[PDB]
């Protein structure tokens, strides 16, 4: 079977196949994912009037991310189940080409909505001090798009060209470090001249942000984290990757949105 | 045929097959399930302004659960019909591997939304007395997630490893007893210093909670409740399990939400 | 072929097959059905504030029924088209087992929502006089569920066991007569001490109720109404049954809801 | 092959097949159709408060028609693509019986919603003078249903029995002429004692009504308008018919609704 | 294989086939497209009350375009994946006739909503000076429809008749130049007697308009832009075309709508 520049799930699914647990888990975690997003959409819409008009843009942007994330995860869940089919003679699910190969790249292009809107929404809650809004916004959006695109290219080479995979991901990482550096400047300015309770929320938002956002590059490298022919180069790694995605999606999108609403309430 | 760590429906469906009644009933009860949830969604949204602002979070959380439960039951209903196909020569529905094996695990991971939100929503209606909100919330969420996850593992071994099934379910049970113990402390504190009419509603909520939540472990054990090769190890048990799920979903999600709204009204 | 406890559509569809007209009509009438329900949903939501707050629960319950009925009819419409497939050599649609057998039981379990909510909603518009609300509600809900369940069993025996079909439907009928007796007591109490215009609406609601609700048992018996091997034991009866269902669904759900809103307006 | 009482699209699709242009166009025009309807739904809902409460029923009814028309056109678009399949050896789309025969009758039964609601909605904007509302409403609804039903029968005989097709359509026409006669009486009464600007809108509504509604009988006769074996008895006529439907649907439903809102604004 | 008047994607997909990257990218970019549109729908609805009543029509029309664009892109995304299927022996996706040929014409007919509504919506924000609203509206709508229709014809000949493709596109272009000429007159009148900040936004709207709208004819010519048998006559051009569409859809529909809301805010 010639798979070409495909993701490692397809190679696992075409050789070993997936056990019931691996196949079902992956389907279940993607389903939890999209349910959280649609549930989050309703929450953010229903709580808009819980904050001053000046902060209501943050609820709106949280809802815009929820829609993107719902539609994407819903599609990816159907994509997963269409790509792998059960073989009763062996009792494992194998790659079914009729359903197309499974690709994570669906998420990446959808992050062209999520990442800009997530970085933007804090600038409608915190007040900056030494930094200008257009400048920060422009840095966030430029580096976000660069990070996403360079990463989207690399992920097509995860099995077919390991050098390319690592170089594109290295470049993507440099844009990610820049986003982190700017979000730190934003959180620190935002803490200036606000209540101790709001500085506590901004402190938590910074940890959430740092961990949740670092899960994505960790999903990118998941197959190779246990090395050459390691534990993770297998159905366990396939499960690990979609699990990490779901955790990072809930944390980076919903819980972040909730924490930002709590900060808005404290400042209202 | 090799089914592996699959649910007992697949083994019934692969050997005996399901009669028209068993197959149709199961499809009908899952359909009733998701219709109730979407109907409940609309009810909770349309009644939000029937309570004081301080209690409106409970309506919002009821609606968040409705969305989760709708999406899950809708998917599981399509999953059921895709997995079993009619054989005209024998007149029974048999496992169709093309549709994947049927798994209840879809529900379990979706309870990672439901259980936390259901336990949380009472804390926005009752007032605690000797117990601190963060502490109770944290206990509810930790034990909930532990209960769900340990149970989610066990259910994959219901046929393949009975020992594992029973040990994981035993561990899950210990977390469940802890949730019950805490919800009793919450109901009793909540009854302190409220009207006799509200204490009556909280009394009913406690019984609803106790029975509806105990149905889930009962669905978990359903195939084996009549023993080895008993009445329930059969298409009757398959019907019994999805019936019990639907009853427990309506009771634990919709009727609980309605009762909590009635309590909020009495306290408004 | 062995069909077992299936509905008479399957036996017609497996022997004679359906003409273009019979197959298309049935598909068209189910489609009209679900379109009416979704259109009704929007109407009831958009008119909620046309009545006093005390009567707005009736609009809400009308909307809850619309959702149930939409989802069910939408599913049944897809079920119809999946079960019967066109045979070009004969020019008739024949039962396709791959799509599963067609069953009316989907409606029945969905009436566990509709019947309770329809009977409940009048009690939020009329005022009872000698009758207590909990008592009436409890009678309506108990007899409704009994009527539905006993009827749901019988319909699986319409071809396979005529005795069973008739006995279960006879039992179902006794619960139906009780519902009628109670709704008469409700309408008569409700007429006491209201304007002549509202007593006219309640008079109409009672006729609507009595005819529309009696259509359901008539659909239940449809194949046999023209006797053994009569006109209706055929594709004409299949068409007749789904037609009667659609008429009764529009009358019992939408037009009833509209009439109850008109009564609420007169009492506002 | 035996097609029976089917629409002429099926005979074209089974003999000649459709060119890429004919097949794609028909799919595109049905898609435009349902997009307009869902877009219209949003417009009518968002503009409800642009008119006095007394005229807001007209916006509501416009939205009820939009839902019906959306659901129907969405279904018919999927029906079209399922019925005709591409044959690479010849490069034309041919009738695929697996997808069922294509039938226009879906629209007809859905007009049992549209026609009554469209005729009704003007009576919530104009004021009648010598004519009584119940009487006019009853005439509109009776003749509408008669027109639709007699026409729905005829369309099944467009190829199989030309005499029947023409007789049923002739009867349908007589009910249509009655609707026209009554709508003229309504427009003329409605013009009495209103501003010159509103009489201008009612003048336009009357032309819109007369042309848009006359397109439907023109679609009914489309195959035969160029005679025996004429230009229109072909894939061109198939395209012509769905084009005419889409134009008439936009005109009779959306533009009419918009014009009625403009009249309501002038009278507010 | 006889493809007839089909788009160039089908010829590429039938000869060379698409690599994983080409096939996946195209699927991903169409998915981003429809997610942006549904996310935009929510944004425009949630911000309606951020502007004076007189400008709220512009938000409504932005939302009407979002619905059209969502439904179309959602359909086209499913169309793409249905038309091309994976061949494991070669590792490329090839045209699957069962899914129908892929056609861009779906977009074109949907522009019969978008183009009129986009041109109309500025006339609800700017005030004209020497130009009459009906006159401008009528010019925009006539030329828009002419541009779209002539272009819709041409695109069916992109491979089959290059002369026809170029002549129809030339005619379409003349209507496009007229739209540009009129939108310039509108922007210049609109700038007269408004604040410097609003003239800056109108200056940006004009550039957005000019570039975003010129991308469409560029997508039309994409295969031939690198000449005879050039780089773009290939899977790269297929990717380039859908990429350009998505960029132009986001720019011309969402960002334009957002900029018009900012202008409305400055004038409120
Ligand atoms: C599809 C179903 C929609 C329900 C349509 C219900 C429309 C009934 C309107 C009743 C109403 O408001 O009537 C007022 C009266 O007719 C003024 O004289
Ligand atoms: C909800 C979506 C979010 C917050 C997405 C975030 C994505 C990243 C932070 C991606 C980062 C990557 C790298 C730093 C290297 C590897 C490639 C990426 C794109 C996965
Ligand atoms: C609406 C969803 C609800 C309330 C879900 C509740 C689930 C439980 C109480 C599950 C309990 C279990 C045990 C106590 C043991 C066996 C395994 C479980 C997870 C089914
Ligand atoms: C919209 C749904 C409604 C009002 C459903 C009503 C259903 C009945 C009144 C059913 C009655 C039946 C009998 C009296 C005998 C035969 C079995 C039943 C369940 C069809
Ligand atoms: C949006 C739906 C509308 C306004 C439907 C209108 C339908 C008609 C005016 C149908 C008329 C017909 C005849 C007068 C003769 C042939 C049969 C009919 C039903 C197509
Ligand atoms: C969101 C949709 C928009 C703004 C659509 C715009 C479409 C055009 C400006 C199309 C122009 C064309 C030409 C000028 C020549 C070739 C054919 C067309 C229709 C693509
Ligand atoms: C599996 C998906 C489950 C989704 C659950 C989402 C839960 C959202 C709640 C976020 C918690 C908000 C921050 C809590 C801080 C507590 C400390 C304090 O406020 O004193
Ligand atoms: C292809 C489908 C496109 C849908 C577009 C629908 C546009 C509907 C708007 C029509 C409003 C026309 C009102 C009549 C204007 C008369 C002139 C005047 O008011 O002076
Ligand atoms: C098949 C699913 C049907 C769903 C129906 C749900 C109905 C829930 C509505 C109300 C439950 C109220 C229970 C408590 C009643 C107490 C009586 C009292 O107030 O005296
Ligand atoms: C499951 C997806 C949606 C989740 C929405 C978030 C739900 C929890 C929101 C918590 C808000 C803060 C409550 C503070 C209570 C302090 C007393
Ligand atoms: C990754 C997606 C980013 C969206 C960008 C939308 C356009 C932003 C342009 C900002 C330029 C400002 C110049 C000052
Ligand atoms: C074995 C071949 C390695 C090629 C790696 C190419 C990676 C991308 C080059 C830089 C892109 C910027
Ligand atoms: C043979 C399997 C691949 C071996 C090389 C893996 C490289 C891992 C790189 C991880 C970087 C963080
Ligand atoms: C997402 C969690 C993945 C855990 C894997 C840990 C590594 C296992 C091999 C050592
Ligand atoms: C190999 C034998 C054991 C199989 C174990 C299966 C995997 C563990 C079960 C799932 C663990 C994660 C479930 C919780 C997901 C939480 C997501 C939050 C967002
Ligand atoms: C299936 C969707 C959920 C429906 C819930 C309906 C709940 C009942 C309506 C509220 C009852 C409030 C108490 C009324 C008592 C009147 C005296
Ligand atoms: C066959 C006997 C042991 C089966 C596996 C038991 C595992 C239980 C879970 C441990 C935590
Ligand atoms: C041996 C009899 C067991 C009866 C169980 C019937 C179903 C119980 C759950 C509903
Ligand atoms: C359909 C049936 C719904 C059942 C909801 C709960 C019924 C409560 C009965 C009243 C309790 C005693 C007064
Ligand atoms: C001949 C067979 C007769 C079967 C009659 C079944 C009746 C069931 C009644 C249940 C209450
Ligand atoms: C053919 C089967 C025999 C006829 C049965 C007729 C039963 C009629 C019941 C009407 C109440
Ligand atoms: C495409 C479906 C939605 C159509 C909406 C039509 C909106 C424009 C109608 C005109 C609005 C008033 C014009 C006053 C000048
Ligand atoms: C094509 C269907 C039109 C709607 C029919 C709804 C029922 C109409 C009832 C009218 C009753 C009039 C009674 C005399 C005044
Ligand atoms: C509420 C909707 C009501 C729709 C009823 C539609 C009834 C369709 C019945 C079709 C019967 C066709 C066979 C007889 C036709 C006789 C005339 C033509 C003879 C060739
Ligand atoms: C092929 C015969 C056509 C008969 C004439 C029908 C003409 C259209 C209706 C007037
Ligand atoms: C021979 C001339 C046929 C003209 C038919 C045109 C059809 C137009 C329908 C919109
Ligand atoms: C991405 C799909 C959804 C559309 C999102 C539209 C972008 C919303 C934000 C636009 C900017 C609003 C105004 C910002 C003013 C900042 C002033 C300081
Ligand atoms: C002076 C009268 C002009 C009327 C124009 C409006 C009616 C036509 C609507 C078409 C909308 C655009 C279609 C592409
Ligand atoms: C091979 C020559 C074909 C020329 C086609 C011209 C089509 C456009 C005609 C004007 C409109
Ligand atoms: C294969 C021949 C290509 C001709 C291209 C004509 C020019 C197109 C762009 C201007
Ligand atoms: C998205 C547009 C891509 C343009 C590529 C231009 C052609 C490059 C080769 C010469
Ligand atoms: Na699968
Ligand atoms: Na099935
Ligand atoms: Na069919
Ligand atoms: Na097709
Ligand atoms: Na594909």
Numbering used by the authors:
A (entry chain E), B (entry chain A), C (entry chain B), D (entry chain C), E (entry chain D): 3 to 270
What did the published study say regarding this structure?
To address the challenges of cryo-EM/ET sample preparation, we developed EasyGrid, a fully automated and modular platform for high-throughput sample vitrification using ethane-jetting technology. EasyGrid is designed to provide fine control over sample preparation parameters and to perform automated grid quality control at cryogenic temperature. We demonstrated that it is suited for optimizing SPA grids by obtaining high resolution maps of three different macromolecular complexes (i.e. apoferritin, yeast ribosomes and pentamers of KR2 bacterial rhodopsin).
The EasyGrid SPA routine starts with enhancing the hydrophilicity of a grid using atmospheric plasma treatment, then dispensing the sample or a pre- coating solution on the grid in a user-designed pattern (typically a line of 100 droplets) using microfluidic nozzles ([Fig fig3]). A rapid sequence of sample spreading with the pressure-wave system followed by jet-vitrification allows freezing unstably thin sample films on grids ([Fig fig3], right panel) before storing them in cryo-boxes at LN_2_ temperature. The structure of the KR2 rhodopsin complex was not previously described with cryo-EM although a structure obtained at high salt concentrations with X-ray crystallography was already available. Our cryo-EM map at 2.3Å resolution shows key features of KR2 rhodopsin including the interprotomeric sodium binding site and the functional, expanded conformation of the central region of the pentamer with numerous water molecules populating the internal cavities. The cryo-EM map additionally reveals all 4 of the water molecules located in the Schiff base cavity of KR2 while only 3 water molecules were resolved in X-ray crystallography data at a comparable map resolution (2.2Å). Last, we observed a different organization of the hydrophobic tails of lipid molecules in the interprotomeric clefts compared to published crystal structures, suggesting the high flexibility of lipid-protein interactions in KR2 complexes ([Fig figs5]). Moreover, pressure-wave-based spreading did not prevent us from solving macromolecular structures at ∼2Å resolution, suggesting that EasyGrid is compatible with a majority of samples.
